[PDB]
Amino acid sequence: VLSEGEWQLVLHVWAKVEADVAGHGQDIWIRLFKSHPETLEKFDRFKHLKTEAEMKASEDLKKHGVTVLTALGAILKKKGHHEAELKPLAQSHATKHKIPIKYLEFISEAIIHVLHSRHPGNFGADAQGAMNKALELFRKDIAAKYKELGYQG
Ligand code: HEM
């Protein structure tokens, strides 16, 4: 459970991210595919992308990034009361996409790195601490649902 102060640190930096959702979406995903290429195999629609240039030019990847960050944003804004939002997400990711928890840890790493680079003034040690805590909360609850749904993760 995060404190009200910790949530504020999270939503404060997120308000900046929302000024350019598409741009942040691309940076985060490209960072992920470059740092952990195996994740690219989960996308039968992006597995063909070879270079960072091709990725930055993909309109579909950009739209996916927006869809992803929008869903994450709605969750964070619930400040822990994200039960309703998580169920449908856990079902598709556990039964259809089959995304293991390890991959959620990898993207969490990408989110932090991108925020740290683009928003240094609003992403200090305390702010990163809160963001990490929020993402771990997300991962903890998703992994729980996974078990309930019959997927080890
Ligand atoms: C920060 C956590 C993430 C959030 C909030 C998120 C959100 C979403 C949403 C809302 C969709 C579309 C609706 C749906 O299928 O449920 C989606 C699709 C998808 N996600 Fe996630 N996702 C996350 C992380 C990941 C990761 C780490 C992977 C893979 C390494 C992944 C792989 C996919 C795939 C394969 C699709 C289907 C895309 C397509 O084929 O059109 N997601 N995700």
Break the chain into its structural domains and give their ranges: 1-153
Among 85, 87, 92, 115, say which to mutate for ligand 1: greatest number of ligand atoms within 8 Å of CB: 92
Burial environment of residue 73 by CB neighbours within 10 A (0 to 12, 13 to 18, 19 or more): middle
**Gaps in the chain after residue (C–N beyond 2.5 Å):** none
Inter-residue contact 153 to 94 (CB < 8 Å): yes
- Enumerate the known binding-site residues for heme b: 93
Neighbouring C-beta atoms of residue 5, cutoff 10 Å: 10
| C-alpha pair distances (Å), 85 with each of 5, 35, 104, 108, 122 | 23, 28, 17, 18, 27
DSSP 44: T
| C-alpha pair distances (Å), 75 with each of 10, 18, 81, 125 | 12, 14, 8, 23
Neighbouring C-beta atoms of residue 81, cutoff 10 Å: 9
CATH architecture of the domain 1-153 equals: Orthogonal Bundle (1.10)
By C-alpha distance, which of 87, 86, 62 is closest to 76?
86
| C-alpha pair distances (Å), 100 with each of 30, 31, 32, 81, 135 | 19, 18, 15, 23, 15
Amino acid (one-letter) located at 122: N
Q: Report residue 50 CA to chain centroid gap.
A: 22
Question: Following CA atoms 66, 149, 109, 73 in sequence, which dihedral angle do they give, to the nearest 10 degrees?
Answer: 40
Q: Structure solved using which method?
A: X-ray
- The ligand 1 atom at the shortest distance from the C-alpha of residue 106 is 27
Query: Rounded to the nearest whole angstrom, what is the distance from the C-alpha of residue 123 to the centroid of ligand 1?
Result: 25
DSSP 93: I
Inter-residue contact 142 to 92 (CB < 8 Å): no
| Resolution limit, Å | 1.9
- Enumerate the known binding-site residues: 64, 93
Residue whose Cα lies nearest atom 38 of ligand 1: it is: 43
**Cα distance between residue 14 and residue 119, in whole Å:** 10
**Cα distance between residue 80 and residue 42, in whole Å:** 28
DSSP 153: -
Task: Look at the alpha carbons of 138, 144, 147, 149 in this order and tell me if their dihedral is positive or negative.
Answer: negative
Pocket of ligand 1 (CB under 6 A): 39, 42-43, 45, 64, 67-68, 71-72, 89, 92-93, 97, 99, 103-104, 107
